[PDB]
Design a protein around this ligand. Structure first.
Ligand SMILES: Cc1nn(C)c2c(O)nncc12
Length: 185
């Protein structure tokens, strides 16, 4: 792909984080803490899952960023509407305002309803995410495999401003403590 020149500097929005997340000082890394991180509750925080949003809002144009997923067993990545549900249980789907892929139990899947199996020969250590607002496209790229395409959502109906979306996943296994990191431009 040749989307690198639409690179944007993403930072994480602390106020949206699940209360167990630890966001670095530079707001570029997030990991699961082993306990509640001693923050007050608010209506923005994802309550049920280890999720956080980027601070940036996109309503036009082409945007690209990269995320490091090295040594994680589980995570979700993509974009979502600014107005997605924060509280309670929900599925990651375009009907609910999410355009995402994930790793879970040694398989990669796109967050369609129902989910779609992905075909990845080289397990990615960094994921590239491209959004074309006007075209209604969200694409995912395997940076470890020379930028090969993972998945394209097309005919997207965003229906609002978009935010970068992250889920560090649970760490029930003791094998998923590693952070998500926003990679430098
Ligand atoms: C194990 C566990 N319980 N709760 C309430 C959690 C939370 O809010 N965020 N991450 C992990 C959690």
């Amino acid at each position: 792909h040749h989307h690198h020149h639409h690179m944007v500097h993403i930072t994480l929005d602390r106020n949206t984080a699940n209360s167990w997340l630890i966001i670095s000082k530079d707001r570029r890394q997030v990991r699961m803490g082993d306990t509640h991180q001693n923050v007050s509750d608010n209506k923005e925080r994802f309550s049920n899952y280890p999720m956080v949003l980027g601070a940036q809002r996109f309503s036009s144009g082409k945007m690209y960023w990269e995320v490091d997923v090295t040594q994680k067993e589980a995570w979700d990545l993509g974009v979502c509407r600014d107005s997605v549900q924060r509280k309670g249980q929900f599925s990651l789907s375009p009907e609910n305002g999410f355009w995402t892929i994930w790793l879970w139990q040694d398989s990669y899947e796109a967050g369609t309803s129902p989910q779609t199996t992905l075909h990845i020969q080289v397990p990615p250590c960094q994921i590239g995410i491209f959004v074309d607002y006007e075209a209604g496209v969200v694409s995912f790229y395997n940076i470890t495999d020379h930028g090969s395409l993972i998945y394209t959502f097309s005919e997207c109906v965003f229906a609002g401003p978009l935010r970068p979306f992250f889920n560090v996943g649970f760490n029930y296994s003791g094998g998923n403590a590693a952070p998500l990191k926003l990679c430098p431009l």
